[PDB]
Amino acid sequence: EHYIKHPLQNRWALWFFKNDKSKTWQANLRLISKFDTVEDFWALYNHIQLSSNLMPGCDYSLFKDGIEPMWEDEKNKRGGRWLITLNKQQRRSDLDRFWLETLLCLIGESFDDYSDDVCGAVVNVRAKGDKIAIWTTECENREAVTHIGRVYKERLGLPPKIVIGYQSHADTATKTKNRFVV
Amino acid sequence: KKRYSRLQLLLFW
Ligand SMILES: CN1CN([C@@H]2O[C@H](COP(=O)(O)OP(=O)(O)OP(=O)(O)O)[C@@H](O)[C@H]2O)c2nc(N)[nH]c(=O)c21
């Protein structure tokens, strides 16, 4: 039809984090923008820095609107994350392409029957090694969590020999073991 | 109902 924008299943919110406003973690979160079409996603993506050009200590988070990008949210507190850990050199080679693929997985509803279990994703730019993660709502749904992990691994193009792990947020927040691996 | 392939999303860029 040409003149109609292509709507997303969900409205998404993009958040930025930098540790330069407050000594309390959550007061450093900024809501950047919300979008609910493919066209509006790309308009936003085109305006913002690549993750590799952010100062160490910064995060982007993309979460379904209504879910705050923190453990304490009702939809994250029983949940967990699939974690991708990058070495320092992968900031250059893999970080930006992995983050974009992650964004496309989310907005495109790429987890078929288990897409509702996905809450969001987070990229941490860190001097010790960058991290990307997909956050899901219930760490005890073995079927949903494992399916999501397998989709994610396939979409990043990681070979069978590379193993990724899922951690519950409850475990991450306690002073971490994997609940699942794929 | 709204699912997009990788291909589709990139084309729309
Ligand atoms: C995601 N976070 C992160 N965070 C605070 O920020 C700290 C650093 O977490 P991070 O940014 O996820 O990881 P990173 O900076 O690499 O440090 P680490 O070595 O702990 O992984 C946490 O130990 C915690 O004090 C949080 N605090 C609250 N209350 N809720 C949250 O959802 C989160």
Residue numbers in the entry:
A (entry chain A): 32 to 206, 211 to 217
B (entry chain B): 2 to 14
From the paper:
The eukaryotic translation initiation factor 4E (eIF4E) protein is a vital component of the cap-dependent mechanism for mRNA translation. It binds the 7-methylguanosine (m7G) cap structure present at the 5′ end of mRNA molecules and recruits it as part of the eIF4F assembly which also includes two other partner proteins, eIF4A and eIF4G, to the translational machinery for protein synthesis. We have used a structure-guided approach to rationally develop a set of hydrocarbon stapled-peptides with high binding affinities and residence times against the oncogenic eukaryotic translation initiation factor 4E (eIF4E) protein. Crystal structures of these peptides in complex with eIF4E show that they form specific interactions with a region on the protein-binding interface of eIF4E which is distinct from the other well-established canonical interactions.
The lifetime of binding measured in terms of the residence time (RT = 1/koff) was also found to be higher for the 13mer peptides (∼36 seconds) compared to their 12mer counterparts (10 seconds for sTIP-05 and 6 seconds for sTIP-06). Crystal structures of the complexes of sTIP-07 and sTIP-08 with eIF4E were determined (C and Table S1†). The essential interactions made by the parent 12mer peptides were retained. More significantly, the added tryptophan (W13) in the sTIP-07 structure was observed to indeed efficiently interact with and engage the patch on eIF4E. W13 formed pi-stacking interactions with W73 and Y76 and hydrophobic interactions with L131. In addition, the amide nitrogen of the side-chain of W13 was also observed to form hydrogen-bond interaction with the side-chain of N77. The hydrophobic/aromatic interactions between W13 and the residues from the protein as observed in the sTIP-07 crystal structure were fairly stable except for the W13–N77 hydrogen-bond (occupancy < 20%, Movie S3†), which nevertheless contributed to favorable binding energy (–3.2 kcal mol–1) from this residue. Hence, the additional specific interactions formed by the residues at the extended C-terminus (W13 and &13) for sTIP-07/sTIP-08 respectively could create a greater barrier and hence result in the lower association rates observed for these peptides as compared to sTIP-05/sTIP-06.
